[PDB]
Write an enzyme that holds these catalytic residues in place. Structure first.
Site, short mmCIF file in Angstrom:
data_model
loop_
_atom_site.label_atom_id
_atom_site.label_comp_id
_atom_site.label_asym_id
_atom_site.label_seq_id
_atom_site.Cartn_x
_atom_site.Cartn_y
_atom_site.Cartn_z
N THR A 174 0.73 -1.17 -0.01
CA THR A 174 0.01 -0.01 0.14
C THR A 174 0.93 1.16 0.04
O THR A 174 2.03 1.20 0.65
CB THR A 174 -0.95 -0.05 1.18
OG1 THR A 174 -2.03 -0.75 0.96
CG2 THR A 174 -1.81 1.52 1.39
N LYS A 231 -8.41 3.97 -0.59
CA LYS A 231 -7.71 4.15 0.58
C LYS A 231 -7.67 5.57 0.89
O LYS A 231 -6.96 6.10 1.98
CB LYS A 231 -6.41 3.42 0.62
CG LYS A 231 -6.38 2.18 0.12
CD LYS A 231 -5.03 1.73 -0.35
CE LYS A 231 -4.79 0.09 -0.60
NZ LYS A 231 -3.39 -0.31 -0.80
N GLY A 279 -6.20 9.41 4.33
CA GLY A 279 -5.83 8.13 3.93
C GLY A 279 -5.48 7.04 4.71
O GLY A 279 -4.93 7.70 5.96
N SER A 312 3.74 0.79 2.75
CA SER A 312 5.10 -0.25 2.25
C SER A 312 5.77 0.54 1.13
O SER A 312 6.92 0.76 0.99
CB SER A 312 4.46 -1.69 1.78
OG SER A 312 3.48 -1.49 0.88
N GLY A 353 4.01 2.17 -7.65
CA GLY A 353 3.14 0.94 -7.70
C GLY A 353 4.29 -0.15 -8.85
O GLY A 353 4.07 -1.17 -8.68
NA NA Z 1 3.38 -3.05 -7.58
#
Ligand code: NA
Ligand code: NA
Ligand code: NA
Ligand code: NA
Ligand code: NA
Ligand code: NA
Ligand code: NA
Ligand code: NA
Ligand code: NA
Ligand code: NA
Ligand code: NA
Lengths: 171, 171, 171, 171, 171, 171, 171, 171, 171, 171, 171
Positions: free
Chosen positions: F1, F33, F45, F124, F156
């Protein structure tokens, strides 16, 4: 990592994702985890580092030559070496090999396993791709190649350690 | 520690911080973690001890000469040795090497990784320098050298194990 | 244990405490953890067993001869030997050496570290002596000798593994 | 186990208890943990198995012969061997040796330690016997022999791993 | 983190750094870890979270009023509550409080410690700031404020968990 | 996340990814989120479960009302309640809130942290998004909105626990 | 820590060192670990934090009053409370109490132990001081006070967790 | 255990295997892990003990009634209770619920997760059945019921903790 | 895995299941874990990898030749070789062999065990098959062949590591 | 600790040693671990702290009164209380009780065990005393009293946690 | 321990061994682990302590009366209480209950398991007794009582924790 092999209509197709993970970060996304051995007659996939796999593949190539191209015999003899040879015994990886008639999973613990089905897979996402492949094989007339693309894609969707950049080879 | 390499416009640049940490105390702030090998044609950086790095680079130099400057071949062969040779097998540094066309992360676990992007990094602060480098590469026309300088500064700001004293080499 | 080296105005002084601890009991309080090597031009201290130190110092002496008193060269080559030699690899002492111009921390993990300041220290109490040393170096006009004595005393006062029986050597 | 040595009035006396424990049961109560080496000139005590000690004592005897009976030199050289020799390095024990002028504790970690006092001890009950011995040495005119008997007896009273069957040797 | 208090010439000064760390990343560099309580007559610093510190300081304020400003009594009573009260028992910050005559380190483990020196510190870098402060107090006539400033700078230089942004309060 | 907040030229933007992970499998990829609280003036968030977040946000809403929209006051009081209240203490989500002028990270350990920069992140993947965000803030003239989108994408791309499905809210 | 009590010639003397250790650093060296209870008729020593001991001593004082000054009865009743009371049960410490005729060690595990000898001790260095005390009691005519000073001093010499700043009380 | 739910053509079907394992032995093979709640309008599956699930289902039934049959609201409120209620918080299980329009995974960690797909699964074999279900949904026109039978059957084939005795319910 | 041998009225029968498990997934269900050695006079089964088994069986074959078909002698010598030979020592399979008169369990730990009954078994499911076998041997007049089939079935029914695909060999 | 009960020809004798151990040091050697309860008709011994024992014995006394001296009934009800009562549940002593006809071992885990022989024992040394007791009961004509004394002696000789100072009570 | 229940021809029989083990020693060989509840209509056996079993059976009796003798309902409700009630939650025995039509294994983990076969068992030796019972039920016409007798004997022969002293109850 996910490596999947499917046999259908006289064709054996093996696919592998391209994700390389260190801890919780992706270092590379287009890895090539599937190679061709035995003069382009044997498919070889691996879950593990490049160097480990390469060294094992070298020994496997040797075994193939020594036993007249007998995949079964070559796999067993590699397993033996991998198990006892002080060098190879230090290598950490899992292998998946196959020709047009046989498929074998080989490990450093002396294991040589041929699943009793037209599909096999290894790696963290292996069981996901396998479940998908078994589903497509038994309920569609899709080719081995298409089943592999779709099953691998589904594995990448579910497993955080497998991505959607699939490399496919065939014999 | 943070070692970052960026390739742009046919130019390859590698930067490294100078912090050396033991437990929770900084022992040195001006370490040189980046060098040039292969007659000034290859960049080499390391996260680890000087003795380990030097021993590994020496073997790498030999691999380069043996395989006619083929970085890809040399990296793979070094990784194999690092994994089999009883002497190198004790070395635990993490390596990052690159020339004008390729970049490779090499580990004592037989790992040889070339990220599929024009930037790569190793060390505790690597991912921070990497995120910054990617952002700059995709949103500015800054050179490889400018990006390394700016990315390393940010990594040193965020990571308690990386500082702002950066050494930069280019090929 | 605390070993501290301070250089100020051409004078280099090394001090070490004398406490020897086994578990949680002091077995000796007047140990000599500091000596002179290389014909009286090199200061050498250690945090570890005496047998380990003697073997390592002997190899260091040889390196100093082979490389014509070059401390940097000698320290690096000792670290490489320490890391590769089957015998030395079993030695786990931590070393601190210095001459009139350089200071190096050398470990069995291939480390060769020269702090970028005029003071360096090793051992459980090192950081405390270092903090005190830097404070005196930067805010008083005290000589290296006085600083070492005062810093070592403060380290022994704070650390349960360091005592106040100090041995000093100068170059 | 408790091994204690005390020097007083030109006499060096070493004592050891006789308890041998396996888990929480006493297998033997009259063990002889103190021997004489160097032609009856050196006292040698040990905490550990008989075979381990014997092998070490053999190597120590050799060292004594090689270096002309120099206890200090012999102890250091044994420590070195014990540390690096692939055979001895597997031995697990702690030694306490002494002649009429020197006392040394020797371990498999390259340690050669001479306490700065007229008493020394090793083993689980060592510190108890030592505390008692230091008390008697500084407040009575008892002989080395009597101090050892009384101190050992007190150690046996306190430690569950040391008993009251004391063997005493002298040089 | 590093919180240091120094008493000199009837003046008491407390300094604290501003670094906030999560894992290996610095989240904030200008934290205020030092405040004044008891109507500006007491200095209070903390190593821990804001909510924990505030909850504890509130109870401390009450203890001060209840026991007529007796810092010693208030500290002891707070420590007792911290140990018994189910609400405070969950708070894990480490506290450092002082007035013109006393200094106390208070923990959730019922610890109330007043060092026997004119300086005290808590936090990861405390011992470094402390060693520096002791050195300055014993070798210069610098004020409590000057010493805190100089000692904190050194602690921030050595500890990766402490920075150079210092807040200072005085009574 | 990954949850990221960036403020540039009066504009405050918050972005969060949508990946929900259980062990090593992605269960949902389009999670929300991020939300708006306090009558659309506060960005909120979270990295954690939705039930935990809802309960905490409700308490935060109450604090905002009780303290007249004062974000700082509200954040601190929420942290104190979170730490002492028997109910909230079981909640383990990590929160990130911001309005047009302030930003706060709030945890169940009593933490209330406002980074001293114009960007903040949790989860993370936070550090990666943060590094990318700072790089763009300091070397481009891109708006907060553009920076968040680009930084979240890069996070991401690197983190296996963060995906590319981003939800954005602005104040 | 070391707390020792000795009875001789109608006098009961209890001593305690002054060292307070956190990890491997001494925070205070003049701690007072021995107090007087029961209107100056009972000696009370403790190994543990101040607040824990204080709370226990308070409950002990109460028990003494309730059972007419019966030390034996008071000790047993405290042990019971310490064992079951939800508050005291959280306290971690070891106590040593004595009047002119009885000595008891009391723990949070319901233990009330009176050694069958004229000496008793607790704390990490307890057995060392005890061994010394037993030696002096049986071989000298020194007073209880002198035996305590000497035995404690010897304990401080041996144990890294006990120092030489001894506080002595008597009843 | 494997619980799978699939929605297709206005029909929502949930299946569960019947294996109950203790260590490495099957205690029961015809377990019914899927129930109907909300007056036969809501499907409820569970991985865990019967009593735990039952207690949770009871609380879920209550929540459904309280919030007018709103599945989403009921799931969130149950998650909250499960998280904080001292009773339910002790329950260990994972739930999967669904009506004709929504599917939710609910855990004791306050999680309420609706996968963004027409299929969802929980339990050790969940991902295998899910991969298969996703494959059939995207490449065949099989009904929800048939997909569940086939996917569950494949999960039982692969997972040693899931068998082939499938119970199926529908709303 | 389950390997079972039963002898009744001169007939010796060995049965083995076919399940191959990796972690918690079945990779193959029709493995052959039983064979005939020594010119068809010796039954041999194994719980482990095939490469390990093949190497061990080959050595066993040699022992049988060298000791003139003496099963006892051959089994003991194989165990001694297995324990001392540098190659075999890496093999970890568990073996079960039998001829018309004797039965032996052989392991890499030097074990050579002949149960004192007419049935023996190895593998995770061994005890279950054994219990069933003994029950049938002692309470029915069923032949060895029937008993093995029935016992193996029951073992596969109870153990998650044993399936119902049985291979049988007789002597 | 060793507590032993032996019954022979209507005579029931209980013996217990006197050693009290803390870690690996004996704190007392003359403890009384055996007493008489129920108006001198019940023998009661314990392995544990005295405070724990006293509280438990008091509850046992009450049970004996409430159930009219029925040892069996009393022992069972004590165990149920021990297991459910919030106070007693913190008590961890192990009890052994007996009258002229029955013997029971009672623990905090709800155990109520009456050995089916004329001897029973608890504590670390119990099994040794038991073995010796059974040997004498079955091969000599010695009385219960003599057997207990002799068996307890042998137990103290073998176990490092049991001494030879025995207290005996008879009914 | 081994508790086995077998249902045949409308008759239900439960048997239990009598061994009680502490560590590696047998404390009692004639324990009664089987009883009759619900006015002689229900069989109840346990693996665990007497106090735990009795406390649980009492609650079970109440559940039976409350739910009109419905074993299924009573078992479920007991399991719920065992899981929620703070008193029962401490009980750790494993239960096995049955009447003429049903059998249930009940645990403190909220487990209520009815195997789908006419036999069930709990305890360390349960699976052995179970395998034997299944073999006899499917291959003989022996009664439920005869089978229990024969199966228990076999379990006691194989398991070191189960003996041959069996108690049998029937309904
Ligand atoms: Na990813
Ligand atoms: Na993925
Ligand atoms: Na940094
Ligand atoms: Na010290
Ligand atoms: Na003893
Ligand atoms: Na710093
Ligand atoms: Na000391
Ligand atoms: Na299965
Ligand atoms: Na099975
Ligand atoms: Na004993
Ligand atoms: Na048995």
């Amino acid at each position: 990592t996910t490596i999947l092999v499917v046999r259908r209509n006289g064709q054996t197709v093996m696919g592998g994702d391209g994700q390389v993970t260190f801890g919780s970060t992706v270092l590379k996304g287009n890895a090539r985890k599937v190679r061709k051995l035995g003069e382009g007659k044997v498919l070889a996939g691996f879950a593990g580092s490049v160097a480990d796999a390469m060294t094992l593949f070298d020994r496997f190539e040797a075994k193939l030559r020594e036993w007249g191209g007998n995949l079964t015999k070559a796999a067993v003899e590699l397993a033996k070496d991998w198990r006892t040879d002080r060098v190879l015994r230090r290598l950490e990886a899992l292998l998946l090999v196959a020709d047009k008639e046989n498929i074998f999973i080989i490990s450093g613990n002396g294991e040589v396993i041929q699943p009793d089905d037209d599909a096999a897979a290894i790696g963290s996402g292996g069981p996901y791709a396998l479940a998908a492949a078994k589903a497509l094989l038994r309920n569609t007339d899709l080719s081995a190649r298409e089943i592999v693309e779709k099953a691998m894609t589904i594995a990448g969707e579910i497993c955080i350690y497998t991505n959607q950049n699939i490399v496919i080879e065939e014999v």
